């Protein structure tokens, strides 16, 4: 029952200790409180009545913003995003290119506006300051952890960019982990528009900040000594839309290619598998069979561990967007396999992160531009940082499955 | 009657004098003839029979070019831009993304071709030379004023780019105003494809050249002494299409975000307004209530000044494309408020310009690349140049409403 | 009969000799074997039974990859690329923007993956090595010729980029010709998705390598002495998709503008032609009337030479994509003119190449970045290289028409 989840949390923490750069340098106050906060945050908003109300209230607010933003895409694509599409094409009336991708553009503009007004910096300063006074983590890495709750792995460190070039290896590693353990507000609204429960997305986003610091300081403890704009609001929104546009185009092209490549791989795996008596062999079978123990470890029932492994594995070997795209049909009435409500939550939390190998190249470019003489350190800690981000997503999923 | 319009022209001229850098340095020949030309041009093509025929002939030619260009977008999007769309989705069959945006790509290619052939430079040389010999304005600033009739605020100064780095503050300011007082051929065809009368777009475009110089020399008189390519036609069209593509994407992303943001703002203004007994409070109400006196000043009837204020205000606080998008439904039979034919003309002329705050950032980049050591002067005169461009659009609207 | 084709091959070879930089420097072994290989390759896969089976087997494999890739675009655009589109919009249900353009993105990703795995370099090394040992051509120019079978004129020389800055004028010219005589894998799949027979596309692609070297060494014989990466497979696919996206957007914008411009030109040619009693005058008539002798020379029947001239001429004065777009309707049952199966093949082969004037500007940029001090030589040999690429496409078409 609940004993299997507590063992899951132990195993995840155990792997991080085994992969630590210095186990004897691990600060118990830091990693103790970091786990305590992520666990309590999960308890607060998933179990305790008052916390569940604050979570649904924030989620409904996010759901209202998305609909407001949908007026913009409704103007551009007219009846191609109306209800008539379902009357004509049925299930195929939901055009992803026009339904989900424009949301990335709107939310990028909105966040850019909330930065200009000082609203974002105000919230980050409070959350980031609460983390450092309770974990003993440095000023810059704590703000980046808080910033990552709302924005991407490359946009988050911008709040502390003059401190990035001279921050310690442990600090840089935590900044990398904070980004890999989290997503961004734009894609969050995208996944929400695909049927993923907003309550799970917001919850996983907030639990990412302490969870990112947790496995960052476990696998890479501090062994050194740390230290310590658009002309108007309309230009801010315009720049945000432009950034969101570029992101929308890149994500869309990636989904065409990656899903397309998977179909090719399944075609080849059908012929190759046939040589060994398994003509029905596909990529989903391999990933499911290989990630089932991991899925079972974090609280997924034995008879649903294989299916849950397909989604978790796909997120790791590719990215979470491709995973969410294959998992989204399982959140409707036309789902090929009816999953338990707890299993749906676990998959949602475990997927909610940028933790993949391809995000290292993005970290080399974005975070590397902020500190060109540190690109060597970024490339070196890349794989370890992905693992740390992965463990954070898995821990948040285990915690979520526990209180559910 | 016609006395209210003449007072409107006086007020607009009065504001420019009050905001002048040196009222005693204002050349009466310059600003006298500049107003005389813009007024006579309005009289010529809106009142006098022969002029009305030349205007409708040019407009029909423009209307034919758009339809020719529509073969290109018809090929790409097929039945999504056919008549069947109206039979299925009704009013929502008109897909803006495919109906209006591709036109920016085609017209950008066409203008780029007309530049290679020397046709554009031929027309600009004649118009620009007629302005300088009648106003005493310098060679470079006069050609830029003429060029702005057809192309954008960043593309226009390219005809005099080696003279830009060393031109006077008054010259640079006029170049900025010429761009803010006008639009570009590409978006012109876009607005025309949205239902805006081509006769009003072409008229406002041509009246922009003397109107731009008018308020430029009023608010910033000359106090110094002025001075004085693609391999083939197929490469020209290709480069133009590429430029138009980038423009199409940026405009589209902006419309998704801005309209989306407005819907969010109206949602918040509904809740905020409710605290003061006004739950129906929206952005359109604020802009209408605040710009109604201005609209009434330029010839809009008292019972239509509020609605006309919504569109004019929106163009100022954002951009003219967003304004035109909200005004376009009022040009159909399904209009929520039936406006007089004169009011429709006034709104069309007053909107027809790039005069907004966000265009300053664009002027810093485009016009700034032509003279990197002058970006300081551009940022300094930015706001004054927007005001001057705004007054030009308002003057052209007052003149248009007078002869109508 | 077959005597007219052999004369066609003679004429094409004759023109190249007349335009040679040094006829006395022409290596007979080189150009003899180069023609012998291109002719035998045509004989092998178009006439001989075993070769026809290898060609249809490779083509069916390519056809399967396209369908696999179509899962990606099906996900993005849903019912807009389903069969329901034909039930509602009829013929206009086939939306080019969603049916053809996404294929460029998928195939770019795939090729980028096959490069990372070493599969591409393996095939190129074998083909390129077979060409040099039989023609005496240098190492670098032979690999580039082989690489061009699969990728574009700018991507092909990347396999020998450190040898490009110091290769001879004859070597650089051949590298240019190898790209102009061929297309790329991405657009190949596009043309295939437009109804062009894959067997003809693959055949023309492979015959491009010896055909490119043939007319390169004919028009520019060697008179000097020659000499002699993404972190993971997922980053490779992502970079390929990004590149393919940029290509998709540029091609799409070009088709909107160029087709749009043609409609404008036909409108003007109707009015201009009317002055000389020919109001029905169009661009297709001019190109057909002017390229009919050329079409008749390469094996097109007298009563089909005019129509075939329209497509061949359009490919030359613009690009092969615009030509294929106008030729594609003639490959369906709703064709305005029913052409013989041999004529359809000849048009397909003669169009299958990047040989146009606009590709010179692309060669200046892409190939020029690999050797910035050689941009002068590229601009100088530009026109000659286009002619050489044109003659290669025409030769392959003559050979194809001969064995058919
Ligand atoms: C859509 C619905 C909501 C409506 C919102 C409309 C209100 C926006 C007002 C703009 O704010 C000002 O704009 C200036 C221009 O962008 C800025 O000046 C700055 O930039 C100018 C030009 O670059 C300079 O002249 C100034 O000195 C410099 O302070 C200035 O900082 C900024 O406060
Ligand atoms: C679609 C319907 C209408 C059909 C129109 C077709 C006609 C176009 C003809 C192209 O014109 C020439 O093209 C050359 C190549 O672009 C240019 O040469 C220039 O560029 C070459 C290569 O860059 C050099 O070799 C030359 O010396 C240099 O003068 C040259 O200036 C230009 O006049
Ligand atoms: C979608 C279905 C198919 C599933 C396929 C999944 C398998 C992919 C495995 C990735 O391969 C490795 O990834 C590393 C990271 O990209 C590379 O390390 C390189 O890059 C790292 C970070 O940049 C460094 O830490 C390493 O030392 C450096 O060798 C490494 O070369 C590469 O072999
Ligand atoms: N805003 C950002 O920084 C961002 N957004 C998306 N992605 C990348 O795109 C993938 C799919 O969302 C993720 O795994 C990230 O690596 N990065
Ligand atoms: N061609 C150009 O230079 C151009 N086109 C459009 N815009 C900008 O986009 C806004 C909407 O058209 C305008 O106010 C301009 O600031 N600039
Ligand atoms: N991959 C490439 O290098 C490429 N692809 C397309 N084109 C250019 O675009 C035109 C239409 O396909 C061709 O003639 C080329 O000049 N180049
Ligand atoms: Na983040
Ligand atoms: Na202009
Ligand atoms: Na090629």
Numbering used by the authors:
A (entry chain A), B (entry chain A), C (entry chain A): 2 to 229, 241 to 416
From the paper:
The crystal structure of a CNT from Vibrio cholerae (vcCNT) presents the first opportunity to examine specific nucleoside recognition by CNTs from a structural perspective. vcCNT is an excellent model system to study hCNTs: it utilizes a Na+ gradient for nucleoside transport like hCNTs and shares high sequence identity (36–39%) with hCNTs with particularly high sequence identity for the nucleoside-binding site (64% with hCNT1, 73% with hCNT2, 91% with hCNT3). vcCNT forms a homotrimer with each protomer possessing its own nucleoside-binding site and permeation pathway. The protomer adopts a new fold and is divided into two domains: the scaffold domain that is responsible for trimerization and maintaining the overall architecture of the transporter (light blue), and the transport domain where nucleoside binding and transport occur (other colors). Two helical hairpins (HP1 and HP2) and two unwound helices (TM4 and TM7), related by twofold pseudo-symmetry, create a bowl-shaped nucleoside-binding site at the center of the transport domain of vcCNT.
The purine nucleoside adenosine and the antiviral guanosine analog ribavirin also possess similarly weaker binding affinity (KD = 470 and 1530 μM, respectively). To examine the structural basis of the reduced affinity, we solved the crystal structures of vcCNT-7C8C bound to adenosine and ribavirin. The structures reveal that the bulky purine base displaces the water observed in the uridine structure while maintaining similar modes of ribose binding, corroborating the idea that the reduced affinities of adenosine and ribavirin are due to the loss of the water-mediated interactions and highlighting the importance of the water coordinated by Thr 155 and Glu 156 in nucleoside recognition by CNTs.
